């Protein structure tokens, strides 16, 4: 019936004075736009069909054409920012928000989806969706005693669209919109479906990606323990956003970092720092670096959980970017730690993998490492054991690499190197 029409036939049907002919043509458009290989989005836009679809969204008397037009417009809005803009410019936003009230759940769902694509374009369309009043009717759809009574596809779409209203920066979402949405995110974060949980963690990870005030809004809602629990999930689509959220939170104040520690996050990091997915290992090492930048009692909890040998491990062998995060974790540790903690770090074997990384072609990591070596030499000075440390660096081949760096290109490198040789290797 409606399989593989031409754009010309769709146009002729939508321009007929016959609601049923329009409905068949609109469904044909939906099927064209639903095919996976090169949907003719631009031809549909050039044919002037968007204003027609938008008007069909408002035909309460004909719910099937509401659905078909909602689906067609959803897939146009899923394209480039220029294609999403065409949908917005046709007035789709208020029309989709009206459809959130629809008594047909498959139509309400499609309006949820479309608004997610529009909001997902970026900050401007996200805030415009919010200004048109989308948040109240979206949250109303979740005002049930038990989320389990909703179809899980429906619930996944809602969670995903909410996550897009939490997404993006410059600017971040309006504070009052974030406060409005957070209680529902907290509830969704306790729902058993893996996809809902993942999308909820993504939303939280967006909201914690910013200044300390934004982090605080989230931490104050009490979700850190649930995030730590989700950090231990077996589904990697859950672990990835949960870990990103935890990592964002520990970029905050030392008190916010402490709530991640108190919730038990450090117990999960033996697995995360050896995780076979390179992105998880990198994000976990980054997170560790922002914990070793904290107080001495927080460094001490990293020590107590046995995580220093795991940092030595990733420094010794991992993807290069992970190793660079490990280098940072060590430079922060040595910068803020006590003498005892630095002594312990050396006893765990940090020196050799640290030197081995001076061979790398990345001048920033060379700076980070040289800074770490100075910090350790300073702790040795305080113990009068500068010489044991010089001997240890020399035996593993580190001296060779440091003089090689006397004649390095970057100026910060060669001045830090010379200083080290002048002072400790005379």
């Amino acid at each position: 019936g409606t399989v593989n029409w031409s754009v010309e036939d769709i146009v002729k049907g939508i321009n007929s004075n016959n609601l049923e002919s329009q409905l068949q043509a609109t469904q044909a458009a939906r099927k064209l736009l639903s095919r996976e290989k090169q949907p003719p989005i631009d031809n549909i836009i050039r044919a002037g069909l968007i204003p027609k679809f938008v008007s069909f969204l408002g035909k309460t008397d004909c719910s099937p054409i509401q659905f078909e037009s909602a689906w067609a417009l959803t897939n146009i809005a899923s394209g480039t920012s220029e294609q999403t803009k065409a949908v917005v410019d046709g007035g789709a936003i208020p029309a989709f928000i009206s459809l959130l009230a629809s008594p047909h759940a498959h139509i309400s769902e499609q309006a949820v989806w479309a608004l997610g694509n529009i909001a997902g374009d970026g900050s401007a369309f996200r805030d415009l969706v919010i200004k048109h009043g989308a948040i109240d009717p979206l949250l109303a759809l979740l005002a049930v005693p038990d989320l389990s009574t909703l179809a899980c596809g429906y619930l996944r779409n809602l969670t995903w669209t909410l996550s897009n209203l939490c997404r993006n920066k410059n600017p971040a979402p309006p504070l009052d919109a974030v406060e409005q949405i957070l209680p529902t995110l907290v509830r969704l974060l306790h729902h058993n479906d893996p996809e809902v949980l993942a999308d909820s963690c993504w939303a939280i990870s967006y909201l914690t990606d910013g200044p300390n005030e934004r982090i605080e809004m989230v931490v104050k809602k009490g979700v850190v323990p649930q995030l730590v629990k989700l950090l231990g999930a077996t589904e990697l689509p859950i672990v990835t956003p949960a870990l990103r959220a935890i990592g964002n939170i520990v970029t905050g104040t030392d008190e916010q970092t402490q709530k991640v520690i108190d919730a038990g996050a450090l117990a999960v990091f033996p697995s995360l720092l050896t995780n076979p997915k390179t992105n998880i290992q990198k994000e976990a090492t980054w997170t560790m670096s922002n914990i070793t930048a904290g107080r001495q009692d927080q460094i001490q909890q990293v020590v107590n959980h046995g995580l220093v040998p795991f940092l030595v491990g990733v420094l010794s062998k991992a993807d290069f970017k992970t190793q660079k995060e490990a280098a940072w974790a060590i430079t922060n540790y040595t910068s803020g730690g006590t003498v005892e903690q630095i002594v312990y770090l050396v006893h765990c074997g940090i020196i050799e993998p640290l030197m081995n990384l001076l061979s790398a072609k990345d001048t920033k990591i060379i700076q980070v490492i040289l800074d770490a070596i100075s910090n350790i030499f300073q702790a040795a000075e305080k113990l009068g054991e500068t010489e044991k440390l010089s001997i240890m660096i020399e035996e593993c081949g580190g001296l060779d690499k440091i003089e090689a760096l006397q004649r390095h290109e970057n100026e910060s490198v060669y001045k830090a190197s010379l200083n080290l040789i002048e002072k400790y290797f005379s």
Partner: peptide, 10 residues
């Protein structure tokens, strides 16, 4: 869904 910012309905 997950971290996709846009997605069509196939």
């Amino acid at each position: 869904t997950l971290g996709r910012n846009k997605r069509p309905r196939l």
